[PDB]
Amino acid sequence: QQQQIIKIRITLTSTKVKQLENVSSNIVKNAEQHNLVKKGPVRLPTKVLKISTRKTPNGEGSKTWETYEMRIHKRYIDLEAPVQIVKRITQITIEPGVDVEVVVASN
Amino acid sequence: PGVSVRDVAAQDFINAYASFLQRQGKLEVPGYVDIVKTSSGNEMPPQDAEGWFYKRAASVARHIYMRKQVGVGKLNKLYGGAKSRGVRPYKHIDASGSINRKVLQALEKIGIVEISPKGGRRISENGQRDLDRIAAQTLEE
Amino acid sequence: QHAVILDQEKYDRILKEVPTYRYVSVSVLVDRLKIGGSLARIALRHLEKEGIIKPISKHSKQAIYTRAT
Amino acid sequence: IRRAAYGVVRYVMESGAKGCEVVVSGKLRAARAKAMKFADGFLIHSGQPVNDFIDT
Amino acid sequence: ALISKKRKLVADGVFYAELNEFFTRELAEEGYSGVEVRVTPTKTEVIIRATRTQDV
Amino acid sequence: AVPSVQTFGKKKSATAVAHVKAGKGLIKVNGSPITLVEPEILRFKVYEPLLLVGLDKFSNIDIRVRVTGGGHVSQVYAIRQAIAKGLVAYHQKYVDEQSKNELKKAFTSYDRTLLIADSRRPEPKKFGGKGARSRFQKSYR
Amino acid sequence: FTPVVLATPIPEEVQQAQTEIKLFNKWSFEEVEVKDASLVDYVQVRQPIFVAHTAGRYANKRFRKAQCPIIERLTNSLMMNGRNNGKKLKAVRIIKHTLDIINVLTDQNPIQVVVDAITNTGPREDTTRVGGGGAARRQAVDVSPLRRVNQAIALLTIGAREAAFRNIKTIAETLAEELINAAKGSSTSYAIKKKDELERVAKSNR
Amino acid sequence: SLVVQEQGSFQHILRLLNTNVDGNIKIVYALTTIKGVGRRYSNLVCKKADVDLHKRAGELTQEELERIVQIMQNPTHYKIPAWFLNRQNDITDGKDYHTLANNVESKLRDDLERLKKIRAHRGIRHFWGLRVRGQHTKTTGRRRA
Amino acid sequence: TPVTLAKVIKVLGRTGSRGGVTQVRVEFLEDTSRTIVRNVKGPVRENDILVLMESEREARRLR
Amino acid sequence: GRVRTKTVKRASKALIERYYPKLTLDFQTNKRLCDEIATIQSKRLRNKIAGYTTHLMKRIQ
RNA sequence: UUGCGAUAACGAACGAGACCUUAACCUACUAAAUAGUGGUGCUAGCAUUUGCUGGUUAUCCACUUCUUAGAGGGACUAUCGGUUUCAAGCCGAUGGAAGUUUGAGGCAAUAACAGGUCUGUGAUGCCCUUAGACGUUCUGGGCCGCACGCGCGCUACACUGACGGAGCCAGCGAGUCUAACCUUGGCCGAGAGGUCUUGGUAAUCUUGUGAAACUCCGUCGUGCUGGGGAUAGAGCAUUGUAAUUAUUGCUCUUCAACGAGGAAUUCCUAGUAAGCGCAAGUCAUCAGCUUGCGUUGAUUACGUCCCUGCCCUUUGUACACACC
Ligand SMILES: [Mg+2]
Ligand SMILES: [Mg+2]
Ligand SMILES: [Mg+2]
Ligand SMILES: [Mg+2]
Ligand SMILES: [Mg+2]
Ligand SMILES: [Mg+2]
Ligand SMILES: [Mg+2]
Ligand SMILES: [Mg+2]
Ligand SMILES: [Mg+2]
Ligand SMILES: [Mg+2]
Ligand SMILES: [Mg+2]
Ligand SMILES: [Mg+2]
Ligand SMILES: [Mg+2]
Ligand SMILES: [Mg+2]
Ligand SMILES: [Mg+2]
Ligand SMILES: [Mg+2]
Ligand SMILES: [Mg+2]
Ligand SMILES: [Mg+2]
Ligand SMILES: [Mg+2]
Ligand SMILES: [Mg+2]
Ligand SMILES: [Mg+2]
Ligand SMILES: [Mg+2]
Ligand SMILES: [Mg+2]
Ligand SMILES: [Mg+2]
Ligand SMILES: [Mg+2]
Ligand SMILES: [Mg+2]
Ligand SMILES: [Mg+2]
């Protein structure tokens, strides 16, 4: 309870890179004003989920194909932080659209 | 004047080390040579019929030298090729696993490779020494 | 049609015709002598070991040999 | 439908919209079907402005 | 919950599509237009955009 | 520390990262001397930046090239681009700029791809045929 | 002018490549005068290369293949009939052995022999069709120099490939015999025989 | 590992195992004109017989021919590993056989007429002249067979 | 046979029914300012030298 | 085919019709001042408008 | 219908273009033990006296070139010649990562078609059927049946090759506990495969997906041959409740046509054609298919209206349900 680090990693997964990098910017600013040592937001390769269909619902016509994509962007921010004052401001202004996971570590 | 097994050409080294193994006669050829094909993807057995196991063991020893961990399945993928499927198109098929497993076990008992706690076989210190002496001879001919 | 064994008269015809062949290869022995390609390869190797033809390329699938001197 | 579609078109256009289109397709007291449009104002049909400024 | 991200985000999309057709079929006589899902820690909130909130 | 640059060369998907530093004439390619590259008939492609400017320009540098990606020809082109760009980068940062410009002119009068990466990228395949332009054969009957 | 020594020993045969860029490491591009003016600036020599493999863009404009080297162009015409598509390494090996054989037989410079073979079988007159279909006529017209070079290379490599198909002789030596007979002018080679056929038809259909 | 030379005293076309084998063909490929003897079987029999593999089948010794015939006819006694054979686990005695020159058509007729005799479906298709391995007969085999 | 060389001055334009034949003005290398219009089969450009088997035939095909 | 449409051309005419004692014969500074004196919605369209404006200035020269 | 011009029109809108996505450049920024690199706090080998390596990020230090992805920059046909009605533009050269709309797509007007789909739908009018059912389920068969005609393909006719050994390199994907997916390694087996473990809900592990063509060295040697591998026999396995009408895989044997294909006809202008494989889709099993991906990489043109189709203008019309 007296300035003890936790070695947490926050992984941020979304499909909307505006909202997602806004959440990661907020996390980086929070650490940068609480003076927490942190590895910056590491950007994973964005995954593309491609689904190739025929456009026709029957089987008539020229064989026309549709590629749909879902794009998934992933970041993670490592931290060494006091948990009881991190979670006093983590649980508020909860982000919509972005899946967050906080995993503690002892490595 | 230091020579590793990288300063010399692959084919020259593998011929020289296969001839060294065939001249020392310690490598315990398994005895189902002369009958086997080296892959399901092959058509014919090796045309050397005496030798080719020394050449395979020389290539495997040089391969372990240039890598860190190679297992039997990695060796089978390495030595596989394109299989003729007759009227259907060609395809990659892995090589024979018993031949490569027995090559690895043979180089274990002549001390070239060892069992490598991260996986397959790494090279031994005596293996580095023997391969470096062969490479030095292959250059200084 | 093409000889796969070599008789003695074919052997002396090789040693008295492959010198003064300006360019020598496997197909050159196969068409100007009447031997097959296996004896042509063997005879090329033997004749450069003796040294009356000398190599230029010595690739597999294509050997270029010229006469010595 | 010429009352209904126009009463939707004018309502959209004086609701503060840049353009409006209504297409009605089907059969109405005739067996042989036809389609008919009711467009007022300005519409874009091509490009990323369709995904930006058009509700469908 | 030991599911991949590729499958979790797809399943979130399928959940959104299933709620969208469920509210499209249910709330059609009080003008449902849209639905927005916000997944939070130990709550998920479902906002129904309708023209008549009183009959929703 | 020691004077050193790092550059790269890029053919279609091959990338050769070259570490050039102050040394004694070493030119290694991912473990091995420049004189054994495979393909043998394309070895003069990676001899070209050595021979356009003379080997005397390489007597006080050690070049170590790690090439990955691509294929056999593409790695050779990325290697020669990496070596030429590394020698120009070393002469830009440590030797005279006039010497660097004479090296650049010697490379570019022979081949622009020694210093400039080829921008030719594979065009995507389209439905309706096996290739990017080619279509499936159509019947009428 | 001296053999430089390095921590990697560059061999002496390739250290003499500093003073002169030869084809593969043997044949000079000097004294490779093109005997047929009107094929200068389309048979491109005089900018030497080390090997007949370059990833050069020559198809993006109309006359860039006139600045492509002639050995690379003859090499490029060997990588066809379908099963040899790609396989420029095989084509470059065939060109290397072809120039070896063209040096062994007929001891002059093989690059000069292949450019004499280009200029001896580029056809100077060719016919075209006139009329809108089968009920037609045939008119003799002149031939562009770039077209002459193109069609010379095609006629040499096609008659090399046909002569090497289904017999013991290899492509690198049927190409060598084709180039030597063309460089003399013989009417034993496919390319000279088709050039004579083309120009005889042109005279008959002026 | 080094190559020395060999002199070719020769004999012409040779009857072996009631089949005219052609000398001027290397021994593995010359013995493949015997039915039941393919390329793998030829190579393994010529390796079990200590026959030089480069020995052209007409310059081969008569006693070497006899050893080749013995290993071909009795292959399980020369450590040929019995997954390598024509008729493993046979049909009537459970014995691994390798069937040779004139007997391959004989065993083929024995298999087919056994299969006709039990009125099995595949024997019926062989009697009808059709394909027997489930091939589609609508478009293929439509000028002969 | 003594062929004559000729230098292309102006590319006058594509002729022929399929457009493969082009029509050019050429001037003779010996005896300059002696000029003829010729039909050329291949890709031709200004300053190209081309070899005439005949020196007396004017091209007529145009448009 | 590098023919420029009327959205580029009309914008360039309407830029030279009122900002002549400004923009000069250089694409780089013309490209920079199109960002101030106009609201072009994309960088590619700005670059086409600036280049055609520069092409027109070199003609009024 | 992009503009310039001409001009009884002038000034606009939809479509084109702009746009969005992807590819190409950034030693400029922001960074990263899920990407690497260099040192060495650390050590450890082999040849040696520094070359090739193997390993510990509060049981190391630092950096970002390479990789990733955010924010931007960049190209506008720049510049300069030539040509043009000194226009719109076009060609050449130089520079440049890029000068083919920079490459490739996505989106895409006015209107139609008696185009396809009622068998994708709990989309649907009407009709038919509804307990001896045309509902539903279960068992078995069939959809694959073979004198034959046609279409898309795969494999070939070989030496620019086959075989053997050796070398040896990608990129796009995908993956299991919200239950059995991708599987390394070890062992057994000729092989297919079995088995014991392991790692991975994934830039972490499969996976450097060590792919194939290719390269080198050998064997063959112009013979339907060691080209080709159809057809067929016997056996061993795997998937599945179930393999017979061979699911597929392996091993041995059998070893057909086919020696480059009339008449005709298809696709294609540069990282394109072609060759080469790989992944995904469907999938318990089954790829000769498709969708994408990368590897190797040409020839020929930068045109025309001759053929074919489409568009416009003029023209003729007794057609407007519009030549059916
Ligand atoms: Mg491989
Ligand atoms: Mg292999
Ligand atoms: Mg628009
Ligand atoms: Mg558009
Ligand atoms: Mg392709
Ligand atoms: Mg042949
Ligand atoms: Mg046989
Ligand atoms: Mg079949
Ligand atoms: Mg960077
Ligand atoms: Mg209909
Ligand atoms: Mg329907
Ligand atoms: Mg209905
Ligand atoms: Mg259906
Ligand atoms: Mg049923
Ligand atoms: Mg069916
Ligand atoms: Mg089709
Ligand atoms: Mg091979
Ligand atoms: Mg990879
Ligand atoms: Mg692994
Ligand atoms: Mg055969
Ligand atoms: Mg069955
Ligand atoms: Mg069936
Ligand atoms: Mg599959
Ligand atoms: Mg099936
Ligand atoms: Mg299908
Ligand atoms: Mg027409
Ligand atoms: Mg009427």
PDB file of N, CA and C (backbone and C1' of nucleotides) in Angstrom, chain K residues 78-98:
ATOM      1  P     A K  78       3.735  18.983 -64.298  1.00  0.00           P
ATOM      2  O5'   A K  78       5.057  19.222 -63.445  1.00  0.00           O
ATOM      3  C5'   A K  78       4.998  19.534 -62.061  1.00  0.00           C
ATOM      4  C4'   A K  78       6.370  19.571 -61.438  1.00  0.00           C
ATOM      5  C3'   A K  78       7.446  20.282 -62.229  1.00  0.00           C
ATOM      6  O3'   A K  78       7.389  21.687 -62.068  1.00  0.00           O
ATOM      7  C1'   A K  78       8.281  18.232 -61.391  1.00  0.00           C
ATOM      8  P     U K  79       7.411  22.644 -63.351  1.00  0.00           P
ATOM      9  O5'   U K  79       8.921  22.590 -63.828  1.00  0.00           O
ATOM     10  C5'   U K  79       9.977  22.892 -62.932  1.00  0.00           C
ATOM     11  C4'   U K  79      11.286  22.361 -63.444  1.00  0.00           C
ATOM     12  C3'   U K  79      11.577  22.662 -64.894  1.00  0.00           C
ATOM     13  O3'   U K  79      12.050  23.979 -65.090  1.00  0.00           O
ATOM     14  C1'   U K  79      12.084  20.407 -64.446  1.00  0.00           C
ATOM     15  P     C K  80      11.521  24.840 -66.331  1.00  0.00           P
ATOM     16  O5'   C K  80      12.367  24.282 -67.551  1.00  0.00           O
ATOM     17  C5'   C K  80      13.779  24.249 -67.474  1.00  0.00           C
ATOM     18  C4'   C K  80      14.388  23.298 -68.471  1.00  0.00           C
ATOM     19  C3'   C K  80      13.867  23.401 -69.881  1.00  0.00           C
ATOM     20  O3'   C K  80      14.384  24.511 -70.579  1.00  0.00           O
ATOM     21  C1'   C K  80      14.044  21.129 -69.276  1.00  0.00           C
ATOM     22  P     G K  81      13.708  24.960 -71.956  1.00  0.00           P
ATOM     23  O5'   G K  81      14.488  24.099 -73.039  1.00  0.00           O
ATOM     24  C5'   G K  81      13.964  23.957 -74.340  1.00  0.00           C
ATOM     25  C4'   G K  81      14.348  22.643 -74.958  1.00  0.00           C
ATOM     26  C3'   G K  81      13.438  22.184 -76.074  1.00  0.00           C
ATOM     27  O3'   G K  81      13.695  22.827 -77.301  1.00  0.00           O
ATOM     28  C1'   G K  81      13.751  20.409 -74.585  1.00  0.00           C
ATOM     29  P     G K  82      12.556  23.747 -77.947  1.00  0.00           P
ATOM     30  O5'   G K  82      11.936  22.823 -79.080  1.00  0.00           O
ATOM     31  C5'   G K  82      12.739  21.861 -79.738  1.00  0.00           C
ATOM     32  C4'   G K  82      11.975  20.590 -79.982  1.00  0.00           C
ATOM     33  C3'   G K  82      10.596  20.761 -80.582  1.00  0.00           C
ATOM     34  O3'   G K  82      10.645  20.982 -81.975  1.00  0.00           O
ATOM     35  C1'   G K  82      10.509  19.196 -78.812  1.00  0.00           C
ATOM     36  P     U K  83       9.607  21.985 -82.668  1.00  0.00           P
ATOM     37  O5'   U K  83       8.232  21.203 -82.581  1.00  0.00           O
ATOM     38  C5'   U K  83       8.031  20.011 -83.317  1.00  0.00           C
ATOM     39  C4'   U K  83       6.729  19.371 -82.936  1.00  0.00           C
ATOM     40  C3'   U K  83       5.517  20.276 -83.023  1.00  0.00           C
ATOM     41  O3'   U K  83       5.022  20.412 -84.341  1.00  0.00           O
ATOM     42  C1'   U K  83       5.487  19.123 -80.970  1.00  0.00           C
ATOM     43  P     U K  84       4.367  21.797 -84.817  1.00  0.00           P
ATOM     44  O5'   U K  84       2.952  21.827 -84.089  1.00  0.00           O
ATOM     45  C5'   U K  84       1.981  20.827 -84.356  1.00  0.00           C
ATOM     46  C4'   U K  84       0.868  20.832 -83.339  1.00  0.00           C
ATOM     47  C3'   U K  84       0.074  22.117 -83.214  1.00  0.00           C
ATOM     48  O3'   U K  84      -0.875  22.268 -84.256  1.00  0.00           O
ATOM     49  C1'   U K  84       0.520  21.205 -81.062  1.00  0.00           C
ATOM     50  P     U K  85      -0.809  23.547 -85.225  1.00  0.00           P
ATOM     51  O5'   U K  85      -1.866  24.553 -84.588  1.00  0.00           O
ATOM     52  C5'   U K  85      -2.269  25.725 -85.286  1.00  0.00           C
ATOM     53  C4'   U K  85      -2.926  26.742 -84.380  1.00  0.00           C
ATOM     54  C3'   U K  85      -2.288  26.929 -83.004  1.00  0.00           C
ATOM     55  O3'   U K  85      -2.354  28.310 -82.654  1.00  0.00           O
ATOM     56  C1'   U K  85      -4.564  26.359 -82.750  1.00  0.00           C
ATOM     57  P     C K  86      -1.231  28.952 -81.704  1.00  0.00           P
ATOM     58  O5'   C K  86      -1.663  28.472 -80.251  1.00  0.00           O
ATOM     59  C5'   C K  86      -1.252  29.184 -79.094  1.00  0.00           C
ATOM     60  C4'   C K  86      -0.363  28.339 -78.222  1.00  0.00           C
ATOM     61  C3'   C K  86       0.326  29.082 -77.085  1.00  0.00           C
ATOM     62  O3'   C K  86       0.481  28.211 -75.971  1.00  0.00           O
ATOM     63  C1'   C K  86       1.957  28.189 -78.551  1.00  0.00           C
ATOM     64  P     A K  87       0.130  28.739 -74.499  1.00  0.00           P
ATOM     65  O5'   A K  87      -0.932  27.680 -73.976  1.00  0.00           O
ATOM     66  C5'   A K  87      -1.301  26.581 -74.792  1.00  0.00           C
ATOM     67  C4'   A K  87      -2.783  26.344 -74.747  1.00  0.00           C
ATOM     68  C3'   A K  87      -3.217  25.027 -74.137  1.00  0.00           C
ATOM     69  O3'   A K  87      -3.300  25.116 -72.729  1.00  0.00           O
ATOM     70  C1'   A K  87      -4.386  25.410 -76.164  1.00  0.00           C
ATOM     71  P     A K  88      -2.495  24.102 -71.790  1.00  0.00           P
ATOM     72  O5'   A K  88      -3.525  22.921 -71.554  1.00  0.00           O
ATOM     73  C5'   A K  88      -4.882  23.202 -71.257  1.00  0.00           C
ATOM     74  C4'   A K  88      -5.785  22.133 -71.800  1.00  0.00           C
ATOM     75  C3'   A K  88      -5.301  20.717 -71.587  1.00  0.00           C
ATOM     76  O3'   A K  88      -5.617  20.246 -70.298  1.00  0.00           O
ATOM     77  C1'   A K  88      -6.040  20.987 -73.815  1.00  0.00           C
ATOM     78  P     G K  89      -4.520  19.471 -69.446  1.00  0.00           P
ATOM     79  O5'   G K  89      -4.441  18.050 -70.138  1.00  0.00           O
ATOM     80  C5'   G K  89      -3.206  17.510 -70.573  1.00  0.00           C
ATOM     81  C4'   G K  89      -3.273  17.056 -72.006  1.00  0.00           C
ATOM     82  C3'   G K  89      -2.190  16.090 -72.447  1.00  0.00           C
ATOM     83  O3'   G K  89      -2.464  14.752 -72.085  1.00  0.00           O
ATOM     84  C1'   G K  89      -2.419  17.804 -74.048  1.00  0.00           C
ATOM     85  P     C K  90      -1.269  13.787 -71.631  1.00  0.00           P
ATOM     86  O5'   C K  90      -0.429  13.559 -72.958  1.00  0.00           O
ATOM     87  C5'   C K  90      -0.901  12.703 -73.983  1.00  0.00           C
ATOM     88  C4'   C K  90      -0.024  12.780 -75.202  1.00  0.00           C
ATOM     89  C3'   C K  90       1.410  12.329 -75.014  1.00  0.00           C
ATOM     90  O3'   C K  90       1.563  10.925 -75.042  1.00  0.00           O
ATOM     91  C1'   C K  90       1.381  14.365 -76.196  1.00  0.00           C
ATOM     92  P     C K  91       2.679  10.225 -74.133  1.00  0.00           P
ATOM     93  O5'   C K  91       4.042  10.548 -74.883  1.00  0.00           O
ATOM     94  C5'   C K  91       4.380   9.879 -76.089  1.00  0.00           C
ATOM     95  C4'   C K  91       5.620  10.455 -76.728  1.00  0.00           C
ATOM     96  C3'   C K  91       6.902  10.352 -75.920  1.00  0.00           C
ATOM     97  O3'   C K  91       7.519   9.080 -76.007  1.00  0.00           O
ATOM     98  C1'   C K  91       6.697  12.536 -76.800  1.00  0.00           C
ATOM     99  P     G K  92       8.433   8.541 -74.802  1.00  0.00           P
ATOM    100  O5'   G K  92       9.758   9.424 -74.876  1.00  0.00           O
ATOM    101  C5'   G K  92      10.704   9.258 -75.920  1.00  0.00           C
ATOM    102  C4'   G K  92      11.772  10.327 -75.879  1.00  0.00           C
ATOM    103  C3'   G K  92      12.603  10.406 -74.610  1.00  0.00           C
ATOM    104  O3'   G K  92      13.636   9.441 -74.554  1.00  0.00           O
ATOM    105  C1'   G K  92      11.925  12.574 -75.235  1.00  0.00           C
ATOM    106  P     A K  93      14.129   8.881 -73.135  1.00  0.00           P
ATOM    107  O5'   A K  93      15.002  10.062 -72.527  1.00  0.00           O
ATOM    108  C5'   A K  93      16.230  10.457 -73.119  1.00  0.00           C
ATOM    109  C4'   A K  93      16.723  11.739 -72.506  1.00  0.00           C
ATOM    110  C3'   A K  93      16.998  11.685 -71.014  1.00  0.00           C
ATOM    111  O3'   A K  93      18.276  11.163 -70.708  1.00  0.00           O
ATOM    112  C1'   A K  93      15.688  13.578 -71.497  1.00  0.00           C
ATOM    113  P     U K  94      18.485  10.272 -69.393  1.00  0.00           P
ATOM    114  O5'   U K  94      18.528  11.335 -68.209  1.00  0.00           O
ATOM    115  C5'   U K  94      19.534  12.332 -68.173  1.00  0.00           C
ATOM    116  C4'   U K  94      19.198  13.429 -67.200  1.00  0.00           C
ATOM    117  C3'   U K  94      18.899  12.998 -65.780  1.00  0.00           C
ATOM    118  O3'   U K  94      20.051  12.677 -65.026  1.00  0.00           O
ATOM    119  C1'   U K  94      17.296  14.579 -66.464  1.00  0.00           C
ATOM    120  P     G K  95      19.968  11.514 -63.926  1.00  0.00           P
ATOM    121  O5'   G K  95      19.048  12.128 -62.784  1.00  0.00           O
ATOM    122  C5'   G K  95      19.519  13.182 -61.960  1.00  0.00           C
ATOM    123  C4'   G K  95      18.409  13.834 -61.177  1.00  0.00           C
ATOM    124  C3'   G K  95      17.665  12.953 -60.193  1.00  0.00           C
ATOM    125  O3'   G K  95      18.364  12.754 -58.980  1.00  0.00           O
ATOM    126  C1'   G K  95      16.109  14.190 -61.444  1.00  0.00           C
ATOM    127  P     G K  96      18.505  11.280 -58.367  1.00  0.00           P
ATOM    128  O5'   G K  96      17.080  10.975 -57.738  1.00  0.00           O
ATOM    129  C5'   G K  96      16.475  11.841 -56.790  1.00  0.00           C
ATOM    130  C4'   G K  96      14.983  11.627 -56.744  1.00  0.00           C
ATOM    131  C3'   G K  96      14.534  10.202 -56.485  1.00  0.00           C
ATOM    132  O3'   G K  96      14.559   9.852 -55.114  1.00  0.00           O
ATOM    133  C1'   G K  96      13.350  11.060 -58.328  1.00  0.00           C
ATOM    134  P     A K  97      15.436   8.607 -54.620  1.00  0.00           P
ATOM    135  O5'   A K  97      14.383   7.437 -54.424  1.00  0.00           O
ATOM    136  C5'   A K  97      14.656   6.134 -54.904  1.00  0.00           C
ATOM    137  C4'   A K  97      13.407   5.299 -54.963  1.00  0.00           C
ATOM    138  C3'   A K  97      12.472   5.581 -56.123  1.00  0.00           C
ATOM    139  O3'   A K  97      12.833   4.854 -57.281  1.00  0.00           O
ATOM    140  C1'   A K  97      11.248   5.468 -54.109  1.00  0.00           C
ATOM    141  P     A K  98      12.577   5.459 -58.735  1.00  0.00           P
ATOM    142  O5'   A K  98      10.995   5.496 -58.880  1.00  0.00           O
ATOM    143  C5'   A K  98      10.218   4.311 -58.994  1.00  0.00           C
ATOM    144  C4'   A K  98       8.755   4.636 -58.858  1.00  0.00           C
ATOM    145  C3'   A K  98       8.246   5.644 -59.868  1.00  0.00           C
ATOM    146  O3'   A K  98       7.761   4.997 -61.029  1.00  0.00           O
ATOM    147  C1'   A K  98       7.613   6.305 -57.670  1.00  0.00           C
TER     148        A K  98
END
